[PDB]
Nucleic acid binder design. Structure first.
Lengths: 151, 55, 56, 117
RNA sequence: AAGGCGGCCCCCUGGACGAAGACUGACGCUCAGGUGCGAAAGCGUGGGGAGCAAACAGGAUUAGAUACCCUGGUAGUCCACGCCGUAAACGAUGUCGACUUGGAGGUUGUGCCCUUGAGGCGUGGCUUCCGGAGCUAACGCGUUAAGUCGACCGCCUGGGGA
């Protein structure tokens, strides 16, 4: 918005871990204001994760997340007809948001049984970096380097 | 008084690159800037001043 | 618009002096200008337009 | 197969393209790169970035001749004067001279029509 | 005078202006018809032809694109000697003369001044921008008038048709 430069809202930290960055992940995963059942799915699929990649439950997230975190993206921009994809160096906070959001659009796409399976296997494969959330980060780092000309 | 042989004086009124300098800058009266530029244009014929800075 | 680097100088001072030697010569003004033929009627008009403006 | 020691970067900066050409001190060309060579068509051909790569792609092509120093001559208006004279430095040559050798007529030859666009 | 005139050098040549004096003694002003000069395009005869470029060709764009944009390209543009007699040939303001508050500049002369400084005090010519009285339908013009007068000439009398 034009005038209206603004603050932002304190989310509560996550009750089990005390992890403010993981609360944002249940919000992103939540549908229809059912935060309850988002938490069920997440807390589950970190048990299934942290067990099968040598422990640390905060830090099995933050290895898988660090892998998908971007560093540049495009930002399309008209000059007078043809339209210039400009690479632009992404903010600290928006790094995580895009990462988290891509993890979940990847997880929501697969064909395992539960969601807590689907999530656990697209946090496994992030940390050993294949599967669709890093195929997203790679096909964004193409676009930034393919259009590195324009900045 | 101003004179195509006097290539000491003519050097104050050309560039690095051997372009004549405008009265605007140098502060010179416009009668004499005519005489200057004519001096310089002869000098260049006789090879005492250069046209450019390629050589 | 000719330049050298004398000894114990950076690169970055020589590349600066190159540009302040070329804007002082007006190479690029004198090349923009001859991209396209301007009819003399247009040359005289733009000259007037500048002179009348710069009364400010 | 040879030594040269001292060369000459000729950068040719049109509006559509740059050609860098490294040559020895008496005109004889050793290597060259263009922007169009470096995987760039159209809009991106022009840019000061694809002038850079041109430089490199050429400083690469004269490892063989084992140049240390060069003079830079720059011929033209366009983007990639300033960029290309920096990407020959940072890819590991010494720069003795920088010259501007751009043809100015002393009113000479009638250019083409104004464009109506 | 207008059209116009732009590297440097020589030869032939026109006008303007200023200073102080001498000389003729109204020899002046305007001008229908008449004569000359008159951009660009265009025409004629003969040369030349780099670049540019009407026509023309191909490529794009587009509903179409006989165009704008791109790649080429012939007359033409250049020289000599003839014609053509026209332009928003415009300051859209005929020529000549006289008078009528100011300011800021530019250009080119010239005369007086511890030249003492690139300066101080005047006096001609051409020219740019403000603006007063007055004028004007208004916009504006405004000592270089579109103000106040005089002399001669040219021209207008609803729009189309034309």
């Amino acid at each position: 918005p034009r005038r209206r430069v603004i603050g932002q809202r304190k989310i509560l930290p996550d009750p089990k871990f005390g992890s403010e960055l993981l609360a944002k992940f249940v919000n992103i995963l939540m549908v229809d204001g059912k935060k309850s059942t988002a938490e069920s799915i997440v807390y589950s699929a970190l048990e299934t994760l942290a067990q099968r990649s040598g422990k640390s439950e905060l830090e099995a997230f933050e290895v898988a997340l660090e892998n998908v975190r971007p560093t540049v993206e495009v930002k399309s921009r008209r000059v007078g007809g043809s339209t210039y994809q400009v690479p632009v160096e992404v903010r600290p906070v928006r790094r995580n948001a895009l990462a988290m959001r891509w993890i979940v659009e990847a997880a929501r796409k697969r064909g395992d049984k539960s969601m807590a399976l689907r999530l656990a296997n697209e946090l496994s494969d992030a940390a050993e970096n294949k599967g669709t959330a890093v195929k997203k980060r790679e096909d964004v780092h193409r676009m930034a380097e393919a259009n590195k000309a324009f900045a | 008084e101003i004179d195509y042989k006097d290539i000491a004086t003519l050097k104050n009124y050309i560039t690095e690159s051997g372009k004549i300098v405008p009265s605007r800058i140098t502060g010179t009266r416009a009668k004499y800037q005519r005489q200057l530029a004519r001096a310089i244009k002869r000098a260049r014929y006789l090879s005492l001043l250069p046209y450019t800075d390629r050589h | 618009p000719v330049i050298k680097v004398r000894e114990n100088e950076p690169f970055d001072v020589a590349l600066r002096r190159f540009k302040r030697s070329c804007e002082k010569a007006g190479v690029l003004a004198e090349v923009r200008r001859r991209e396209f033929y301007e009819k003399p009627t247009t040359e005289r008009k733009r000259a007037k337009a500048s002179a009348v403006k710069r009364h400010a | 197969r040879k030594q040269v020691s001292d060369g000459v970067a000729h950068i040719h900066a049109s509006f559509n393209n740059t050609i860098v050409t490294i040559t020895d001190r008496q005109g004889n060309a050793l290597g060259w790169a263009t922007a169009g060579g470096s995987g760039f068509r159209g809009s991106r051909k022009s840019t000061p970035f694809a002038a850079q790569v041109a430089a490199e792609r050429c400083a690469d092509a004269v490892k063989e001749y084992g140049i240390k120093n060069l003079e830079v001559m720059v011929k033209g208006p366009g983007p990639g004067r300033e960029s290309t004279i920096r990407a020959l430095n940072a890819a590991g040559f010494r720069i003795t001279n920088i010259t501007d050798v751009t043809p100015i007529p002393h009113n000479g030859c009638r250019p083409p029509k104004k464009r109506r666009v």
